[PDB]
Design a protein around this ligand. Structure first.
Ligand SMILES: N[C@H](Cc1c[nH]c2ccccc12)C(=O)O
Lengths: 525, 528
């Protein structure tokens, strides 16, 4: 016979909806009808969104969409790191770094370049040895990644002839990526765009969804439903009654106030990185694009009111707190008990969320979509397929939640009740174990690759290098060097050449590369 | 200077001399290394099998070329373990019985990673075709050109030594030990003390300060490696670390072995290890130039040594009185902790399973590799020790589980041995993987190419038994998924892309089965 899914209905557009539609369009090879039900788009100012480097490999390449093509259509810029500003020093927010007890600037980078090795030990470990033994005054980021010097000079990750210099991710307008993908899905993949509100969810006797009724009275029948409805979870939470697990016992931020800020890219150039600017009750992103930069103060409302937060946010950029356009979001932090129940699959905010401290939102969507295609059911909805999908989403999420918690728990700051309450939170066992490992001088989640394949990154997402960037950046160091280094003088010496190579290539590239500004100007024909 | 200054290794053989040689290179002559070994009573070379990383991870680390060590220990090539009669009842025989469905009862467990189409391994396209009647081909022959190369007994290299395929090694264990002793003493300033141990001297915390020899000499050290074999003279006896018996997971606990002269002119040489099923266990065959090692592994709760020796002798038609037999009674399991205080267990002193999937040398290499990475100073940081212990326990339990799957999913129920296998519990870890397989999903999908996998030990160690190895054993024993992977029902272009991969396997197999020398002719050239 034929027990296959025939129709898929996706509730909600935006990134989650149109990413799911486009990806399933390619994955299911036109054997399945795909419908997107999206309420017509109330226009909101492009507050900017940041990504991680596998986005082109895991998503746009699967779809056959060249990098330059999609960037041109959504005002995209380059990202070589997240730069953390004032995460160690007390007081009011400021774009400018305060000065540490030891005299150095309170800035550290989390770049995506992965670290070379000598004698199967990463350069991280040789740096740590020299720092703990007084043989260097260099920061981890400066010693270990040429990317740090390239970002300090605001240079581009590519040459004008488009040769790659370094690894990088992307800044873009979310609503314009959604628009680009809608058009691609509708014109290239026979996806049906239904512009209407949902009013009823029709369910059979055993609790499966049979169809969505729209305002216009159209009945969208389907065998499988993707909830991309955002925080409301119109299908997964409301209709299906799957509980959401709040994880404010792990992260405190639960609110943001955002906007977009015109920018003199002639004077200042463009920063090829996202900035995480510390504040009293949370932090503030800055996502440079050609002509402006998106920003949003992420805060806990148990430690600041919306007005306190809006004032503090406005003060930061020196904006008129009444006559500038603000978007105010109150978000869920956590995940559904189960991402997929019966014939309902949650993707995006409907599934899970953390604050965008390490740009995890788009990644969560393409990872979930990738796992849906791999676990794609027939009408029997085998419980093992569903359970293994749910297992992958919970491990993906908890991994990134824990990484983020490490950013708060190991901040030295104690000046406001927010920063103090961070130290009151329990750490998940998983991240206590990794702290203990790091503190003994051992690597955490050693990377295995030279490519810098989505599947390799998904199983080991936050590698040794990323733990060092955050731990060492916040001032947490191992108790001692890796003991094996005391027996390996030849390896120490081999590592000295690697540090020299980082210095040389940093200097060579800081001279030969165009500015982010000049590459963007060339790109946006 | 709080560093370890001296390392004392109790015991030689493979575990002792591999540890000595590896630490010699790893510690860059900043540390004194002593091997205390009782002088060597010669024993029959019953043969040992290995995995492919051994040349890259060990001999190449030491700068020893492949041809050099193979020539010194009568080594041959290995492209798989071949399982014979694991599905059909009756007495042991070298020759495969026939299944109810007409297939011969042989299946291969070769090396390499399976190619993919649309991020789905070739295993899954094969399974679809088999469950849907579109193929009568075995998993092994559809999915690995190596199966055809092994069927013709051809070599994994051409005579000019171009690589054709993946492979590992058969060798004489005692000759590899001898080769490495000589290398460690003459090239790495290791001190060989030929004496028995009489005393283990300890401080107030129970840390070892020195070993007394029979001659009365006192070997001081800061770190002790127990390579003493099953007796665990340091880890179990002196340190009193309990051994966890795991006969509630595997039943075999005995072996009777020997070496068998072989007409390599008539029969050629098999470039693989054979696992020949018997009534109370199984029998290895490890071909080398001129002879083959063999040993019947058995449970003594289901056969006596006589029963086992007779049955083993019957198999090859050996004279059960006038052939030389080695009789081993082994412990199966691992220490509660591999490393206690300043005592590190390696080899049989740490852990054992029967050599059903050639895990002996690998267990040694992995422990040695992890010792160098976790190498302490005199403060013996408990986190270094704990992380070492965690790696060895997970390594062992993973392979114990994989091995149990060989017995639990054998369809055989004809003897009380095969029946008792099905009375044992499966560990959770392996139940979960069976359930995943049975829904058509991959188990332990490889995440790197072959270059990375066999080039960086850390990539192999985190993914040792891949999707391919689960299919080789499950499908080989006749456990199949309930249904194909549902995603495949929506992916006709991907089905078609997989058909080209099957065609590529056929072409490579046929091209190479014609152009390659016999294992015999490559061995003849190698041992010139
Ligand atoms: N890591 C795997 C182990 C392996 C694969 N096939 C066999 C056959 C016999 C023993 C071990 C293995 C590899 O080497 O590819």
């Amino acid at each position: 016979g034929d027990n296959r899914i025939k129709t898929v209905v996706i509730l909600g557009g935006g990134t989650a909806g149109w990413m799911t539609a486009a990806y399933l369009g390619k994955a299911l090879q036109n054997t399945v009808k795909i419908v997107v039900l999206e309420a017509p788009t109330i226009p909101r100012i492009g507050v900017g969104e940041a990504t991680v480097p596998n986005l082109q490999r895991a998503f746009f390449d699967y779809l056959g969409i060249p990098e330059e093509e999609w960037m041109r259509e959504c005002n995209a810029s380059y990202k070589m790191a997240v730069k953390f500003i004032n995460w160690r020093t007390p007081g009011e927010g400021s774009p400018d770094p305060r000065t540490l007890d030891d005299g150095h600037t309170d800035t550290f980078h989390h770049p995506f370049g992965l670290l070379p090795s000598a004698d199967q030990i990463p350069l991280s470990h040789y740096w740590a040895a020299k720092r703990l033994q007084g043989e260097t005054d260099e920061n981890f980021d400066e010693a270990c990644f040429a990317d740090t010097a390239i970002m300090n000079a605001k240079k581009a990750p590519r040459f004008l002839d488009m040769r790659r210099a370094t690894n990088y991710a992307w800044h873009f307008d979310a609503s314009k990526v959604a628009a680009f993908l809608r058009n691609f899905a509708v014109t290239k993949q026979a996806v049906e765009h239904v512009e209407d509100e949902m009013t009823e969810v029709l369910t059979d006797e055993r609790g499966f969804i049979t169809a969505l009724r729209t305002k216009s009275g159209r009945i969208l029948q389907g065998d499988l439903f993707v909830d991309c409805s955002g925080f409301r979870g119109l299908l997964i939470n409301k209709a299906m009654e799957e509980p959401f697990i709040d994880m404010s016992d792990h992260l405190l931020c639960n609110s943001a106030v955002a906007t977009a800020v015109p920018h003199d890219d002639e004077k200042n150039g463009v920063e090829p990185y996202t900035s995480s600017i510390a504040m009293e009750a949370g932090w503030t992103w800055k996502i440079p694009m050609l002509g402006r930069f998106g920003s949003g103060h992420v805060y806990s409302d148990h430690f600041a009111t919306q007005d306190e937060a809006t004032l503090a946010f406005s003060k930061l950029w020196g904006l008129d707190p009444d006559n500038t356009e603000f978007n105010h979001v109150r978000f869920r932090v956590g995940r559904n008990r189960r991402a997929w129940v019966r014939n309902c699959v949650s993707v995006g905010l409907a599934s899970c969320f953390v604050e965008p401290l390490e740009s995890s939102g788009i990644y969560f969507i393409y990872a979930a979509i990738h796992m849906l295609a791999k676990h794609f059911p027939d009408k029997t909805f085998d419980k093992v397929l569903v359970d293994r999908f749910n297992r992958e989403i919970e491990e993906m999420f908890d991994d990134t939640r824990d990484f983020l918690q490490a950013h708060y728990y190991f901040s030295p700051r104690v000046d406001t009740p927010f920063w103090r309450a961070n130290k009151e939170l329990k750490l998940a066992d998983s991240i206590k174990d990794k702290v203990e490992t790091y503190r003994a001088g051992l690597p955490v989640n050693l990377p295995v690759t030279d490519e810098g394949n989505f599947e390799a990154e998904f199983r080991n997402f936050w590698t040794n290098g990323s733990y060092y960037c955050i731990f060492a950046g916040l001032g947490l160091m191992p108790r001692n060097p890796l003991p094996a280094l005391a027996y390996k003088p030849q390896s120490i010496a081999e590592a000295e050449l690697l540090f020299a190579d980082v210095k040389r290539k940093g200097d060579t590239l800081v001279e030969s590369l165009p500015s982010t500004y000049d590459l963007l100007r060339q790109l946006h024909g």
